[PDB]
């Protein structure tokens, strides 16, 4: 079952169809090479234990529940809305009580009655698509797979493959 306490899987980035461009083992870290002493077995793999533990906690707090590593499209509720709020325009003119003045021979280039109009306005409809880059970090905390490739295929992460498509369940790269 358990084969080590393994290095996390770092997800890549992409210009977003809703994929995270697969993931791959972290190889910008030690903790699985050689040369030190045998008294560092609980001084260097206690480190690696600690890193993984911080990851499980970190992922659980900051990540929405999902049935898939890469959903390929987040719902409109779960993209995180950063769209603007309402605003007000003070309209500069009467055009229904300072136009009978120009018909009355007045040329123009606030002296008539104190009618001033305020107009409200809103902002866009919800969008569904790939996740933002600020919210990529919180949705893709590195994953620790603790029993690598154990059990039947069909519970293996195939979403760590940067060629896989989960809405056709095939890997096609045209190579």
């Amino acid at each position: 079952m358990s084969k080590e306490i393994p290095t996390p899987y770092m997800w890549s980035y992409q210009p977003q169809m809703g994929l995270a461009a697969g993931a791959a083992q972290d190889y910008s870290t030690r903790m699985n090479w050689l040369s030190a002493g045998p008294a560092m077995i609980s001084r260097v793999n206690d480190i690696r234990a600690h890193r993984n533990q911080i990851l499980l906690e970190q992922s659980a707090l900051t990540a929405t529940p999902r049935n898939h590593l890469n959903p390929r499209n987040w719902p409109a509720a779960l993209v995180y809305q950063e769209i603007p709020q309402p605003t007000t325009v003070l309209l500069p003119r009467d055009a229904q009580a300072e136009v009978q003045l120009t018909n009355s021979g007045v040329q123009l280039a606030f002296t008539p009655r104190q009618a001033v109009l305020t107009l409200e306005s809103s902002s866009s409809q919800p969008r569904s698509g790939g996740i933002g880059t600020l919210q990529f970090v919180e949705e893709f905390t590195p994953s620790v797979y603790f029993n690598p490739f154990s059990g039947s295929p069909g519970h293996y992460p195939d979403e760590f493959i940067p060629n896989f498509d989960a809405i056709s369940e095939s890997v096609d790269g045209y190579d």
Binding site: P8, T29, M31, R51, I54, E57, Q58, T62
Partner: protein, 50 residues
């Protein structure tokens, strides 16, 4: 927790964490200061700068 996950590795290896004079045992710290005038031990250790 919710802290950086490379924090335990960094702390150990002195890329981040605490100054070697809070990391070292207190007896060694006073030993180094006493014999500072003829047998430096300051350059044998790292201070994290962040």
């Amino acid at each position: 927790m919710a802290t950086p996950s490379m924090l335990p590795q960094w702390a150990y290896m002195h890329i981040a964490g605490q100054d070697a004079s809070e990391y070292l045992s207190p007896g060694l710290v006073q030993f180094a200061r006493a014999t500072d005038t003829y047998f430096s031990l300051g350059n044998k250790f790292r201070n994290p700068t962040v």
